[PDB]
Amino acid sequence: NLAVLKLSEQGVLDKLKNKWWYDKGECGAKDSGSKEKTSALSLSNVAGVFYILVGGLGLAMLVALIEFCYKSRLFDRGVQMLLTTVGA
Amino acid sequence: FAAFSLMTIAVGTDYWLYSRGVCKTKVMTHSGLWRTCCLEGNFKGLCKQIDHFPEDADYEADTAEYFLRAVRASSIFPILSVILLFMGGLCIAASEFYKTRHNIILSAGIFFVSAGLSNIIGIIVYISANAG
Amino acid sequence: SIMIKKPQKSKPGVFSFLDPLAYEIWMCIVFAYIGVSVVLFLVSRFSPYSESTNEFGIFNSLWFSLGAFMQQGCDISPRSLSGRIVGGVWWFFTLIIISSYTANLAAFLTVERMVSPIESAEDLSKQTEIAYGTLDSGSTKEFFRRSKIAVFDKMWTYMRSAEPSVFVRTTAEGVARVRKSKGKYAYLLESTMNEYIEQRKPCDTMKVGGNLDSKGYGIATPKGSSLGTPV
Amino acid sequence: SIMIKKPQKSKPGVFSFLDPLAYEIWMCIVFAYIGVSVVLFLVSRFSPYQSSESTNEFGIFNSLWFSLGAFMQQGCDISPRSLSGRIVGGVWWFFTLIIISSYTANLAAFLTVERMVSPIESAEDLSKQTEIAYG
Amino acid sequence: TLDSGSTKEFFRRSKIAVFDKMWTYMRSAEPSVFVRTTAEGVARVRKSKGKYAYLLESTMNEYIEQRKPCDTMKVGGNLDSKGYGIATPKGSSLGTPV
Ligand SMILES: N[C@@H](CCC(=O)O)C(=O)O
Ligand SMILES: N[C@@H](CCC(=O)O)C(=O)O
C-alpha cells in the first residue's frame, strides 16, 4: 500500500507504461500516420466523368434519330391560355 | 474487315498484359481476358481460368465494387463491339442488293460508331478493375 | 555521427510535365476526343431538310473539339439541338480534367525532397528493424557501455543483445557492411571519418542527424617522461 | 472495450467529382441558372421599337444556351448587344468567376480520400441485429 | 497553483527537471503567483489577458469550460493520474463497510 504510491508519485509507472507500450510502435499507422505523398492520378479516380461523357453521346445521337424520324413524316394559340391558367 | 479481324483476334486472346503472379495454387504472367495463363516457371503454358473471389470485409452490396466486377469478369461491353461490327458489316454487304432506296447504308455506319463506343467503355472498365 | 546508405533519388526526365496524369488517362483522352468529334459530325451532317446550310464537317469539328478542350474559344457553335446537347457534355468534360491538371501540377511544383529516415537516433532506440553497431576495442563502444542517458542505455542493451554480432573489427568492414545491408544496418563512427567517406566515390553513403558529443584527438605520451611539456 | 477486425479502405465512388461543393449549393446553382436565363429572355424580345421584334437573336433557348456557355468558361458566338440584359450578364460573369475559382481550389485532394466505414461503435446493434456475433 | 494544495505539494516534491524548474519559477515569484481559493485564480486568469496561466484538476477544468461565459480553455493533455477517495480516521470501524 505504501509502495505502489511511491511508484505513482515518481512516475515509474509512466516510464514502464511508455517502455512497454509506446517505445514498441511497430505496425503501420502510428509511425507512418504523419508522412506525406504528393500524388499520381490514375484512371480509377476519374471514371464517372468518362461514363457521363459516353452516355451523353448516345443520348444526343438518339435525339437526332427521332428528329429524323418525326421530320420524315405550342399547338393552338388559344389553348396556351388554358395551359397557362391551369399552370398558374 | 480489318476491324472485325483485329477485334476478334483481340477478344480471343491469352496475351494482353504481363505482370507478376501465380499459375495455379492449392511468376511472370502471360495474362489475358480470363485465362490468366503463365510462363517462365516450373511449367510454362498452363492457363488457369480466373474469376472474382476475394477475402474481404464482406462487402454486402457495395455496388461500385460489385456490379463493376459483374461487368468485368463477363465481357459484355467488349463482346458487343463484335456484334455491332458484324451487324454493320452485313449492312454494307447488303448495300448492293435491295438498292436504290438511298437509305440503307446510313443504318450501317451507326453500328460502326456505336461499336467503338462500346469498345472504349470496355477498355475503361478493364483498366478500372485491373486496379480494382 | 551516424552513417547510412544514401537512398537513390529520382530525377525529373525530359517529359516531366506529363506527370500528373498517367498514360492510361492520356490514351483515353485521345480516344474520347476522336469519338466526340465524330459524333458531332454524324449528328450535324444528317440530311436535315438546305443541305449546305449548316457549317460543320469532319474537319471543322476536329478542331472545334480541340478549341473547346484547350480554352481558346472557337469560331462557330452548334446550332442544332442535338449538336448543342452533345457540345455541353464536352464542355463539362473539360472542366473536370483540365482543372485537375492545373491543381495537381501546383502540387508537383512544391516539393521534391525525401522524407529523411531514422534521424537523431531515437528511432534507433525505438524500432527493431535496422541494426547498428560500433567499432570493437573502441572508445565509442566503451562510451555506450558507461553511458547513463536512458536512450543510450537502451541502445547499449540492443547492441549487447545482438544476433548475429552487430559489432565489427575494422572501419572498412562496417563500411562494406552498410554498403551491402541496403538500409538494414546503420553504423556509428566519428564525424571526420564520416565526411571523408562522404567525399569519396561512389558517394553512396550519407551522414544523417547532428552530433552527439564533443570528443577530441590529441598527442599521447607515456606518463612522466620529459617529452610532455615540449610536445 | 470492443475489438473488431480491420476494415478495408473504401475508395471514393463514381459521383465524387461534385463532392467538394455541398448539395445545397448545387441546388441554388440550378435555380439561379434557370432564373438568369429567363430574366435575360425577358429583357430582350420586349417589343423593341421593319424589324420590330427580331432585333436580337436571343430566344429563350438561345439564352438557355448562353448562360450555360458563360458558366463553363467558353463564351458562345452571340453577345447581349443591348443594355439592361448586360447588367444581368455582367453579374452572371461575376458569379461564374467567384464560384468556379472556389470550386477548383483543392479538387485533387477530394479525389484521393480513402476514409473508413466503421459499422458499429456504441455497440447496441450487437443487441439489434443478429448477424455479427460477439463473446 | 492553489495554496494548501496537493498540486503545490506535488511540484515541491517532484524530481522531473522541467517540473523542478517550474517549481523554481513558482517559488521565485514577484508578486505571489499563488492564490487562496479556486474562483480567485479563475478571476485572475479571466482578467490577466493571457499573462497568467493556471493549474488545476481536469474535472474542475471541464466544469469551468461547460459554463458561461465560456471564455476559458483547456490546453495540452494531462500530467498524471490522481484520484478522489473517501477518507476515514485511521483505525475506526467504518473503513471496511465504506
Ligand atoms: N579515436 C577512437 C576511435 C574509435 C571510437 O570512436 O570508438 C579510439 O581510438 O578509440
Ligand atoms: N484534491 C486536491 C485539490 C487541490 C490540488 O490539486 O492541489 C486537494 O485536496 O489537495
Please check whether residue D106 touches C, CB under 8 A.
Answer: yes
Spacing, Cα C187 to ligand 1 middle (Å): 14
* Grid coordinates given for D73: 468558361
Q: Do A41 and C100 touch (CB under 8 A)?
A: yes
Three-class SS state of B18: strand
**Pairwise CA distance, residues B26 & B37, whole Å:** 16
Residue of A nearest to C101 (CA): A41
Task: Confirm whether residue E96 is marked as ligand binding.
Answer: no
Spacing, Cα E59 to ligand 2 middle (Å): 12
**Pairwise CA distance, residues C85 & B35, whole Å:** 42
**Residue/partner pairs of E50-57 with CB below 8 Å, 24 or more apart:** E55/E1, E55/E7, E56/E1, E56/E2, E56/E7, E57/E7, E57/E82
* Grid coordinates given for C196: 571523408
Count CA atoms closer than 13 A to B28's CA, side-chain side: 5
Q: Which domain holds residue B93?
A: 1-132
Contacts of C103 in chain D (CB under 8 A): 104-108
* Distance separating the N- and C-terminal Cα atoms of chain A: 86
Spacing, Cα C226 to ligand 1 middle (Å): 26
* Cis amide leading into C164 (omega within 30): yes
Which method resolved this structure? cryo-EM
Alpha-helix residue ranges (DSSP H) falling in C14-137: 23-44, 58-69, 81-108, 122-126
**Pairwise CA distance, residues E56 & D122, whole Å:** 31
Cβ atoms of B109 and B116 within 8 Å: the answer is: no
* Grid coordinates given for C158: 540492443
Residue of E nearest to A8 (CA): E81
Contacts of C39 in chain B (CB under 8 A): 113
- Please give, one letter per residue, the 3-state secondary structure of A11-77: CHHHHHHHHHHHCCCCCCHHHHCCCCCCCCCCCCCCCHHHHHHHHHHHHHHHHHHHHHHHCCCCCCC
Q: Which residues contact C194 (CB under 8 A, 6 or more apart)?
A: C1, C3, C207
CA distances from C39 to B121, C35, C80, D85, E20 (A): 16, 6, 13, 34, 80
Task: Confirm whether residue E4 is marked as ligand binding.
Answer: no
Spacing, Cα C214 to ligand 1 middle (Å): 13
Please check whether residue D8 touches B, CB under 8 A.
Answer: yes
**Pairwise CA distance, residues B115 & B82, whole Å:** 7
Name residue, grid cell 440584359. D85
* Grid coordinates given for E16: 522531473
Name residue, grid cell 492449392. B26
B102 alpha carbon, distance to own chain's centre = 35
Look at chain B and report how many structural domains it folds into: 1
Q: Which of residues 35-94 of C touch B (CB under 8 A)?
A: 35, 38-39, 42
Q: Do B123 and C31 touch (CB under 8 A)?
A: yes
Which DSSP state fits C9?
A: P
The amino acid at D15: F
Pairing type for strands C185-188 and C131-133 reads: parallel
* Grid coordinates given for C37: 468529334
Q: What are phi and psi of D23, to 5 degrees?
A: -60, -35
CA distances from C75 to B85, B117, C65, C67, E19 (A): 35, 28, 11, 9, 76
C-beta E58 within 6 A of ligand 2: no
Residue of A nearest to C23 (CA): A42
Spacing, Cα C135 to ligand 1 middle (Å): 8
Three-class SS state of C224: coil
Q: Which atom of ligand 1 is nearest to the CA of C141?
A: 7
Report the CATH number that the domain containing residue B74 is assigned in CATH: 1.20.140.150
Q: Which atom of ligand 2 is nearest to the CA of E6?
A: 7
Contacts of C21 in chain A (CB under 8 A): 41
Residue of C nearest to B110 (CA): C42
**Pairwise CA distance, residues A21 & A27, whole Å:** 12
The amino acid at E33: V
Cβ atoms of E73 and E65 within 8 Å: the answer is: yes
- Gyration radius from chain C CA atoms: 34
* Grid coordinates given for C12: 525529373
**Pairwise CA distance, residues C207 & E58, whole Å:** 45
Q: Which residues contact B60 (CB under 8 A, 6 or more apart)?
A: none
Q: Do B120 and A54 touch (CB under 8 A)?
A: yes
Count CA atoms closer than 13 A to A53's CA, side-chain side: 26
**Pairwise CA distance, residues C68 & C94, whole Å:** 8
Of B106, D46, B15, E21, the closest CA to residue C45 belongs to B106
The amino acid at B10: A
- In the sheet with C205-208, reading across from the earlier edge strand, the strands are C131-133, C185-188, C2-5, C205-208
Q: Do E80 and A11 touch (CB under 8 A)?
A: yes
C-beta E34 within 6 A of ligand 2: no
- Closest ligand, as measured to the CA of C190: 1
* Cα angle: C164, vertex C179, A36; to 5 degrees: 100
Cβ atoms of D74 and C74 within 8 Å: the answer is: yes
Q: Do D104 and C74 touch (CB under 8 A)?
A: no
Q: Which atom of ligand 1 is nearest to the CA of C217?
A: 1
